[PDB]
Amino acid sequence: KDWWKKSVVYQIYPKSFNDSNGDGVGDIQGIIEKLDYLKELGVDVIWLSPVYDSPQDDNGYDIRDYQKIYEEYGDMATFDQLLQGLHDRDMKLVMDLVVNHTSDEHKWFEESRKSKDNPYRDYYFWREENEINNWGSIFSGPAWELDEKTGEYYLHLFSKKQPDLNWENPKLRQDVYNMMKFWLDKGIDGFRMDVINFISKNTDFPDGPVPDGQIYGDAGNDFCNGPRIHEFLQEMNQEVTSKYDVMTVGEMPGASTTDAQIYTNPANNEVDMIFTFEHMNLDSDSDNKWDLKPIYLPDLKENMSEWQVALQENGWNSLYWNNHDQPRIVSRFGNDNRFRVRSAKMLATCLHMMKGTPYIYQGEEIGMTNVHFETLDDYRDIETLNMYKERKEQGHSHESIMQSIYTKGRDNARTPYQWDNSENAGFTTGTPWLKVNPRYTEINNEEALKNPDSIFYYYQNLIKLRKTTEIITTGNYRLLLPKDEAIFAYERYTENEKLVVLCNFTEEEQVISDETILNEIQKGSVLVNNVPNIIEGTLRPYEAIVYQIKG
Amino acid sequence: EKDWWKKSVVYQIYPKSFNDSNGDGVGDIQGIIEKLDYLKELGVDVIWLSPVYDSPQDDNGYDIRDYQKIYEEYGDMATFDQLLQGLHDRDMKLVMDLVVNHTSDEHKWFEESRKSKDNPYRDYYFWREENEINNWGSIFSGPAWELDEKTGEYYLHLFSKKQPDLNWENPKLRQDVYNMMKFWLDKGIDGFRMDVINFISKNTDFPDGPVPDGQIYGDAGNDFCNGPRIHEFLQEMNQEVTSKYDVMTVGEMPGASTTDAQIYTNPANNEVDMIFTFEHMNLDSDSDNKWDLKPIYLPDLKENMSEWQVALQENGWNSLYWNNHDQPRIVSRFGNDNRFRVRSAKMLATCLHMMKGTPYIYQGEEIGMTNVHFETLDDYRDIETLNMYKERKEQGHSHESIMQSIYTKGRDNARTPYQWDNSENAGFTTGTPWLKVNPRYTEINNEEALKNPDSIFYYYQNLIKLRKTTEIITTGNYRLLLPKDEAIFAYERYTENEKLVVLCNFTEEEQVISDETILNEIQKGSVLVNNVPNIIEGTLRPYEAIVYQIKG
Amino acid sequence: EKDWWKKSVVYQIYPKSFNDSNGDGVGDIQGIIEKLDYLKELGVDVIWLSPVYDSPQDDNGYDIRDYQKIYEEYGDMATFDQLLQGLHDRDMKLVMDLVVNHTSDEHKWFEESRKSKDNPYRDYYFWREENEINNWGSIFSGPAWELDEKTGEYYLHLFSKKQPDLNWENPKLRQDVYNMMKFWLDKGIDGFRMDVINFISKNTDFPDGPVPDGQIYGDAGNDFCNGPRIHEFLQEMNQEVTSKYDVMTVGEMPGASTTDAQIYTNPANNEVDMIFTFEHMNLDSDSDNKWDLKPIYLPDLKENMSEWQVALQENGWNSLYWNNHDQPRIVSRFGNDNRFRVRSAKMLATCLHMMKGTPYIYQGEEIGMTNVHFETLDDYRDIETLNMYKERKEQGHSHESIMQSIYTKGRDNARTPYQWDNSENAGFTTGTPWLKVNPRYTEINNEEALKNPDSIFYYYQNLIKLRKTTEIITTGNYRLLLPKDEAIFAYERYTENEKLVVLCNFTEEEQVISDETILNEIQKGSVLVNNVPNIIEGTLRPYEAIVYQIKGA
Ligand SMILES: OC[C@H]1O[C@@H](O)[C@H](O)[C@@H](O)[C@@H]1O
Ligand SMILES: OC[C@H]1O[C@@H](O)[C@H](O)[C@@H](O)[C@@H]1O
Ligand SMILES: OC[C@H]1O[C@@H](O)[C@H](O)[C@@H](O)[C@@H]1O
Ligand SMILES: [Cl-]
Ligand SMILES: [Cl-]
Ligand SMILES: [Cl-]
Ligand SMILES: [Cl-]
C-alpha cells in the first residue's frame, strides 16, 4: 500500500545514459547492462524518459507513435527485457505520459491536417486567421502555425512539430485512455503525466495582455490551470489508472499548493503526487528563465517549505533538484570545483531529509556538472537554439545569451553520462550525439566507485537511511531560521522524535547562535553528515549535519 | 539576333541581398522589380537571378526543395511572372540557375528515396552500405557520406548534408529533370547557368581516392569531376530540351580542361553556349584549399586567363567574371579598397571587359562594394564558412588565422546587402537585414555613385556602351603581352584590320613601359577608354588602365 | 509657407492661345492680365506661363533668341511686370520655363559661335567635322546634325535645325545661364520648369546608335539623355542661383527613372523640388514612337502612375498632370468627349487630383476642351507635326494613317485658342486666329461653363478647394487597389488614422465592386466628393468617380 511513498526514483535520459552499439546514442540495451549498478546504488524506481517512436524534434517528447519503440533505442522485445530485468530485481518502471500534444508526424495529425472533413480534424485545435490569438510558443515564435492544405492554423504550445491535442473531444480522450491501457497491460509501474495542467484550454482563444517590452500575450489561465483538469484526471483514473497498481506523478507548472492538495488527496483519485516548478524559477529576474538573477536563499527555503506544509497532512510531494529540463544542481546552487564533492553531498542531504519521494537524475549521484561549450553549434536543444535566435534579434549580446545557456540550458543535463576516463567517458565507442563534458577525466562513475569519499557512497547511504529511518517518511516538516541567507535549517517531527537538518549553502563558515537549536542538537546524535569531526554549533563551508533526537 | 548572348552583358542578382521591399530583412522579387529601370539605365541586357526556388536555405537556395515553386519569402509565382515580363518589356532577358547535381533532402524525391530500399525513388540518389562508402570529403567539410537510420545506408553529398546528390545514371531521373526544365523554358526564361554540371558523372564503384600527406579525405579526381558521361548528358539535354528554345546556356565547370571546353562550346556540338570556369579564382591560395591564403602572383593570373581566351577564341565562348556570390569582392581581392578604390575598380573593369567573352557584373561591383570584416563568427552566415571554422578549429588552427581566411575568401563578403544610399541599412531594408550591412555604406552607395560623374557606375555604364558599339571587343582574337611582368597586365585584341592594346597596372606603383613593341603601338594608337585623365605616354600611374585602338 | 509648392495648384497658360487683347489673332500678356479675376475665382495659386521670351517662334517660344527680352507680339517688359505684380497682389505666383538645353540659332551666342572655329563662343555649342558626327535623328525629324558652310562643320540640334544645343561642358556657358536666371529671379518670379533638363549632359564622343529595322537614324540610348553630369549641374545651379530665392523648381525629364527621381527630388540633395515625367504619356503607343498608336490599357496606366506615387512618397515629390501644350487633351485622349464629356472630365480630374503631388491644370481642361480634327494638314501649325508628316509619308505611311496619328497625338490639339464664349472665334480674338478655333466652341466655352451649375468648371473649383482644406490629400501615402481591373482605377490615400478610397470608372460600362475589403471600408466612410448624384454604394455608373473619407479614432 502506497509503496511509492518510500521509493527513491532514478531518472534515465535514454539518449544520454549508455550507448551499447557504437552509434553515439544511448539505447535500451545500454540501460539493461547497468541494472546491477542501479540496484547497487539502491534506487527502486526507474523513471525512463521517452523511448517512443519520435522524429526527435524535442528528443522524444514529440511522439509519432505511442505504442512503438523508437528504432534507435531498440525494439519492443528489448523494452520487454528492460521491464522484466527491473521486476526481477524488485525494481519498478515509470514512463512519461505525453498527452498534451503529439508529433506533427503522428497519424492523428497527418490525418487531421488533410481536410476540414477528415474524421481526425477535431483531435487538434484548428482556427482561421481571424480566430487565432497572440500567444507565443514556449520554444519561441508564435503559438499558431498555418497549414496551406486547409488554410487554417493549428495550435502548438511547444514546437511547430508538437501540435496540441484537443481534450474537449471525448473521442481523443478515449483514444488516449486505450493507449495508456496498452502500456499498463504490459505491467509498467506508473506514469509521469507531462504538463498535465496544460490540457484544459479556453477554446475562445482570446488575446492576452502583452507585458511591457514583449511581443506575445500572457495566456493567464487560458491554457494553464484551466477549469477541466480535475474532471479529465478523474475520468482518466476511472477509465484507466484505477485498474492497475501504479504510481502517477502530475507535472504541473503553475499549479498552486491549494490545487496540489486537491490533485493529491487520495479520496479524489486524481494523481498520487505532484511535480512542481516553483523552486526551479527563483533564480530569474521575472518569469523568463533566461533573464538571470542569483538565488536568494530565503526565497528557496520559503518556497520549498510551503510545499512541505501544504501537502504533509494527506498530499505528497516529488522531491527533486534537477532533471533533463534543468541545469545540474551542483553547478546551479553548489560549488562545482573546490567544494564539488562536499556541496553535492550537502544538496543531497537538504533534499533527501524532506517529506516526499526523492528523484535522483542520472549523473547527480556522481556530481556531474553544467557544460560550457564555446559556440552555439555544440548545443542541440531546440529550446536553446530557438531562444538564441530570438534573444539575439531582441538585442542581447552573444556573451549574455551564452551566459543564459550556461546557467539554464537543458543540454547541461543531457551531455552523456560519464562512466569512466576512457574516450567519451566510456559512454560510446563512436561519436556521441552531444559532446561529453571534458571534465569526465575528473568526474566519472569509475572514479566515484573507487573513491570511498565520493558522492556515490553518500547517495547510497541516503537511500539506505530512507529504508531504516521511519521519521524521514512519517515526520511533519517545519522551517527554522527562515531569514538566514546562508543556512537552510529545518526539522522533521513526530510526537516523540525529531530530526534537525542543518545545511550551509555557502563557502563561508557559519556559527549558529539560535539557542533553541543549540539545546536540541546537544540531546541528539548525528544521523548523517558530510564533513568529519563536527564542531557542534558550527557549519563549515558547505557542511550538512542531521541530528536525531528521541523523547 | 543570331548568338545574341555573345554581346550581352550579364548582371547577377543575389536576391536575398539586393532589395527588401516589405521590411522583413531579406531581399525579394518586388524589390528587384523596383530597380528594373536602374538596371536598364546601367545598360545590362541579361539578369542572372540566383535561386528563388523553394528551398529551406541550407545553402541559400542552391538546396532546392521544389524546382517549380517560388520560395515564399521572395514572392509568389505571379510576382515572378511580373519580373520576367518586366524584363521582356525592356528588351532584357532572365537567366536562372539549373541546380541538378543535387536537391534538398526535403525535396519529395529524396523524402521518398530515403523511406526504403524498394521505394521507386531509391536510385534517384546514391545509397550505399557502410562497407561500400569511400573516403571522399564534402566540399562543405566532413565526410561526403551521411548515414540514414531509416534504412541503415549512407547517401552521397558532395555539398551539405542537406544536398544529396542526384543519380544521373538513372534515365527516369534525367527525364524528370528535362521535364522540369521545360516548365521554366515554356514560361519564357531566357537561359540557364548549369551549376557544377561537370560533377554529374560519378564512378558508381566509388573507390577510395589517394589521401595526400597531412589530410583526412581522398582526392576523387575523375571519379566525380569531369567524368566520362558529361558530353553524353549535355547532348541528351540539348536534344530533349534546350535546342527547342532561343536561350543561352552556360556550363559551370570547376576544373574543366580547355580540351573538353573546346568541345562543349563549339556550336556544331550542340552542348552549351559558353563555359564558366575557375582558373583565375583559386590562384591566391597555397594549393587547392582556398582557405590556405597566398598573395596573388600576377603572371599566374595572366597565364590562366589568357589560356582560356586562346583556347576558345576560334569557335568557343567564355563567361568573363571577377566575382559573384561565391567569391570575395574584386576591388578588395585584387585592387585597393581605400585610397585607390574608385581608380582600381575602374582598372579591374577595363581588364576584364576588353577580353573576348560575355561579361558578368555582380550586384554592387558597379559601385565598388568591398569585402566585409566582422569581429565574430556570430555575424557570419554561410554554411561553408561556419562548417570550415568548426573543422579547422578542431584540427588546431588558430582563431585569428581562420578569421583571416574568412575575411579574404568567405562567401559572405559577396552577400552583404546592396548599398543603395546613406539611410539606415543603406536603404536595403526598413527592418533588420538578414546579414549585416557593410559599415562603409555611408561612403559607398548607389546614390553617391549616381551623383558623382567620376564614379565607378558611369565607368561600367561606358564599358557596356563600348561593347555595343565597338565590334573588335566581340570579334577580336586575343594575345597576352608582357607575360612575366609582376605589375602590368597587358594584352592585345586583334582582327584582320585593327587592334586594341589594353594596359592595366595591378599595383599602387608607377610603371614605366620598356617594351619596344607596345611603345610602338601606343605611339600610333588613339585612346578608346582610360581611367586617369592626362595620360603620360608610355607610363601607367598607380592602378592606371588605358586602352589604345589601332585602325590606321 | 514652408514647402508651399506641395499644396499649390498650377494652371498652365500657353500665351499664344490664351487671350488676344489687341486683335492681331495671337494671344498676349495684357490678355492674361484681363483674366486674373477668373484665374483667382477658379482658385489656382501658381501660373506656369509657357515662353514669352523673344523668339522667332520656330518652336513657339522654346527657341529663344534673347532670354531677357519679351517677344514684342506678347507685350513689353512693363506689361510683363504688371502681370507678375498682378499675380502677387492676389497671392498668386508665376513660374516660367527655363529653356537651357538649346537656344535659337538667332541667339547672339550662336550668331557668334558659327562665325569661325576660333570664335570665343565656338564651344557654347557642339561643332564637329563630318567624320566626327553620328547617326542620331532630331526629335523633330531628319538628322540631328546640320552643316554650316561658313566653317564646314556640323552643329548638333536635338530639336529643330533652329534650336542648336548648348554645350554644358563649358563652364563659361554655365555661368552665363546662371546670370540669366538671376535676372529673372531678382524680378521676383516664383519658380522655373527646367525643360528637358536631363538632356544637358552629352556623351561627347557622340557614338553611333543602333538603327532599328526599317529606320535611318541610330537610337541615342543614354548618350544625350541621363548623362553623368546632370546631378552635378543641378547642384551647381542650385548653389549658385536657385537656393538664394524662395522659389519652386520642376525638372522635366523624359526617360529619368523613379530611382533617379528619388535622388533629384530628395531635399537633402538640393537639386529640384519635383519631377515632371512622361511614362504615363507614352503608354498608348505601340513602341517608343508616339505616332504609332495603340489604345491605352488601364492596368498599364494604373501601374505606372502608382510606381511614381510609391517611389517618391517618402522623400520626393511628383508633378501630377494629364495634359499640357505637348499632349492631346485628356477628355478626348482617355475620357469620352461626346455625351459623357462632362462626366468623364470630372472623373479624370478626381483621379489625378486625389493623388499625392502638385496638380497641373492645362488651360481649357477646366471647361473640358477637346482634341481638334482638321480635314487637311494645312490647318495644322506645329513644326513637329508638319515635319513628321513629311517623314512618315516618305517612309510609306498612308495619308489617312498619318492624319489619325495627328488627331490622336498632335500638339496642336492643345494649342487651338481657348474657348471663352460663343461669339466669333469663341471670343479669343476679333482678328484671324493664328491657329483655327475648335468648331465645338459653340457648345464648349467658358461662359457656358460658368452659367451651368453642373459644369466641369465648378467641379475643378471644388477639387482645388479640397486640396486647400483636406490635409490627407497632401500628407497621405498612396497604394493601388484592384490592380488588374480593366475598368476601375481604385486606390487609397492613408495616414496613421485616416484614409481616402478613390474609385474611378474609366469606362462607359457600369461596374459592381465585389471586393469585400473595399466594400467594408466605404461603408465606414463618408463621401468627400463625387460626380454623379444618387450613389448606389459599391456600384460605379459609366464614368462615375467617388471618393470616400474614413476617419479612425
Ligand atoms: O514536450 C514539452 C515538454 O514536456 C515536459 O513534460 C518535458 O519535461 C520537457 O522535456 C518537454 O520539452
Ligand atoms: O550548390 C552547391 C554550389 O553550387 C554552385 O553552382 C553555386 O554557385 C554555389 O553557390 C553553391 O554553393
Ligand atoms: O524645346 C523643345 C521642347 O522642350 C519642351 O520642354 C517643351 O515642353 C516642348 O514644347 C518643346 O518643343
Ligand atoms: Cl481526408
Ligand atoms: Cl519550433
Ligand atoms: Cl553540412
Ligand atoms: Cl527642323
Side-chain angles (χ1 to χ4, degrees), chain C residues 58 138 140-141 157 159-162 383 387:
Chain C
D58 201 42
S138 160
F140 296 162
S141 314
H157 61 95
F159 296 94
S160 87
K161 293 170 204 300
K162 297 176 62 64
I383 188 167
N387 285 6

Side-chain angles (χ1 to χ4, degrees), chain B residues 13-204:
Chain B
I13 293 180
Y14 195 66
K16 210 172 189 87
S17 301
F18 184 73
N19 194 36
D20 178 9
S21 67
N22 62 18
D24 66 358
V26 297
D28 52 64
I29 295 167
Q30 180 55 36
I32 299 165
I33 291 165
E34 289 174 19
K35 306 295 191 188
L36 290 181
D37 292 328
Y38 163 73
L39 297 168
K40 178 56 176 289
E41 185 162 342
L42 174 57
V44 296
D45 45 25
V46 177
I47 302 314
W48 161 27
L49 178 62
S50 278
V52 297
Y53 311 109
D54 185 48
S55 162
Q57 312 297 135
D58 199 49
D59 192 19
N60 285 353
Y62 290 95
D63 57 314
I64 296 175
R65 177 166 61 200
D66 186 334
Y67 286 111
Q68 302 179 24
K69 175 176 170 164
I70 305 305
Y71 183 55
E72 184 144 30
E73 288 196 318
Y74 293 134
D76 53 19
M77 190 60 75
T79 305
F80 178 88
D81 291 347
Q82 286 169 330
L83 169 62
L84 181 60
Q85 190 57 55
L87 288 163
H88 290 174
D89 287 344
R90 301 171 168 76
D91 298 308
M92 295 165 78
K93 289 180 188 87
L94 185 61
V95 163
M96 298 207 300
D97 282 289
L98 181 69
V99 186
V100 298
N101 179 68
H102 51 265
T103 69
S104 177
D105 66 330
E106 304 185 19
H107 192 286
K108 69 192 182 187
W109 301 341
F110 194 76
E111 284 194 329
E112 289 301 312
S113 188
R114 80 192 313 167
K115 288 190 179 174
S116 64
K117 291 174 196 180
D118 68 346
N119 189 280
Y121 294 94
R122 186 64 168 183
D123 62 1
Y124 272 48
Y125 301 86
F126 293 104
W127 286 102
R128 292 293 184 278
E129 297 184 340
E130 196 193 350
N131 77 322
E132 300 297 281
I133 67 162
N134 71 8
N135 64 357
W136 294 348
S138 165
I139 294 165
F140 294 164
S141 310
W145 294 96
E146 180 74 6
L147 177 59
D148 194 328
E149 292 76 8
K150 188 63 187 167
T151 55
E153 298 198 328
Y154 293 71
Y155 64 93
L156 180 68
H157 64 97
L158 294 178
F159 297 95
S160 81
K161 298 169 194 306
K162 294 173 63 58
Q163 287 170 295
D165 284 58
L166 286 167
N167 176 18
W168 278 73
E169 307 303 293
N170 184 334
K172 285 164 155 49
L173 175 282
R174 299 201 300 272
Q175 190 61 53
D176 280 351
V177 167
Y178 304 156
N179 291 343
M180 174 277 288
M181 293 173 73
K182 291 176 197 190
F183 168 85
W184 288 109
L185 295 173
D186 288 348
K187 290 169 71 62
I189 74 152
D190 297 287
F192 279 122
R193 191 183 80 128
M194 302 186 190
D195 296 0
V196 293
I197 200 61
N198 68 334
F199 284 15
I200 70 177
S201 178
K202 269 74 165 167
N203 180 346
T204 60

Side-chain angles (χ1 to χ4, degrees), chain A residues 58 61 101 139 158 162 192 194 251 324-325 410 414:
Chain A
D58 194 18
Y61 289 96
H101 51 268
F139 299 159
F158 296 94
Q162 288 166 294
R192 187 185 81 126
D194 297 2
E251 186 198 27
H324 68 292
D325 292 331
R410 301 191 296 177
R414 300 173 182 196

Side-chain angles (χ1 to χ4, degrees), chain B residues 177-360:
Chain B
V177 167
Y178 304 156
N179 291 343
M180 174 277 288
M181 293 173 73
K182 291 176 197 190
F183 168 85
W184 288 109
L185 295 173
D186 288 348
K187 290 169 71 62
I189 74 152
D190 297 287
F192 279 122
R193 191 183 80 128
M194 302 186 190
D195 296 0
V196 293
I197 200 61
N198 68 334
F199 284 15
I200 70 177
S201 178
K202 269 74 165 167
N203 180 346
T204 60
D205 295 330
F206 297 111
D208 285 340
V211 180
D213 272 312
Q215 311 286 74
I216 295 81
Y217 304 108
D219 193 336
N222 296 136
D223 291 332
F224 78 78
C225 188
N226 306 312
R229 300 189 75 181
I230 304 300
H231 293 289
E232 183 197 343
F233 291 153
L234 292 178
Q235 286 176 57
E236 189 183 75
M237 180 185 287
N238 190 287
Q239 185 76 8
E240 178 63 32
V241 185
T242 53
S243 58
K244 302 172 172 166
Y245 305 87
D246 180 18
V247 295
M248 61 176 272
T249 60
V250 183
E252 183 198 37
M253 300 194 196
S257 67
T258 63
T259 299
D260 281 306
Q262 285 169 325
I263 297 167
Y264 292 132
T265 66
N266 184 340
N269 294 333
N270 299 303
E271 291 184 24
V272 297
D273 297 315
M274 77 188 71
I275 204 168
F276 182 116
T277 56
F278 299 77
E279 80 281 353
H280 63 312
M281 291 288 107
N282 202 28
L283 296 174
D284 50 351
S285 306
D286 256 348
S287 184
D288 282 340
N289 192 326
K290 70 179 181 188
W291 307 116
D292 295 320
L293 307 179
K294 191 185 79 168
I296 193 68
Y297 184 54
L298 187 62
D300 293 343
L301 181 61
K302 296 184 302 180
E303 200 296 314
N304 279 279
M305 291 181 90
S306 300
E307 186 178 4
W308 284 86
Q309 291 286 289
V310 174
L312 298 190
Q313 72 190 358
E314 181 180 2
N315 53 51
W317 205 258
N318 290 283
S319 296
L320 299 170
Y321 76 93
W322 282 134
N323 58 193
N324 53 50
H325 69 294
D326 290 333
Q327 302 294 343
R329 291 197 171 268
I330 194 68
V331 77
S332 295
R333 191 195 197 150
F334 293 162
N336 172 293
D337 71 1
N338 189 11
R339 79 191 184 286
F340 290 116
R341 191 183 61 85
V342 169
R343 195 187 283 196
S344 73
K346 291 174 177 167
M347 182 281 287
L348 287 157
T350 309
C351 187
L352 189 70
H353 284 241
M354 296 289 146
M355 293 184 178
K356 186 181 191 83
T358 296
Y360 287 57

Side-chain angles (χ1 to χ4, degrees), chain A residues 110-119 149:
Chain A
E110 274 202 320
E111 288 308 303
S112 182
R113 80 187 305 161
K114 280 171 187 182
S115 163
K116 290 163 196 179
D117 297 323
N118 184 279
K149 180 53 191 307

Side-chain angles (χ1 to χ4, degrees), chain B residues 41 82 447 450-451 453 465, chain C residues 222-223 228 231 260 269 484:
Chain B
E41 185 162 342
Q82 286 169 330
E447 175 166 346
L450 291 174
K451 290 188 294 195
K465 290 176 181 182
Chain C
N222 289 313
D223 289 315
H231 294 293
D260 301 334
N269 297 328
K484 306 311 176 237

Side-chain angles (χ1 to χ4, degrees), chain C residues 249-262:
Chain C
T249 58
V250 185
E252 185 201 29
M253 298 196 194
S257 69
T258 50
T259 287
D260 301 334
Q262 287 176 326

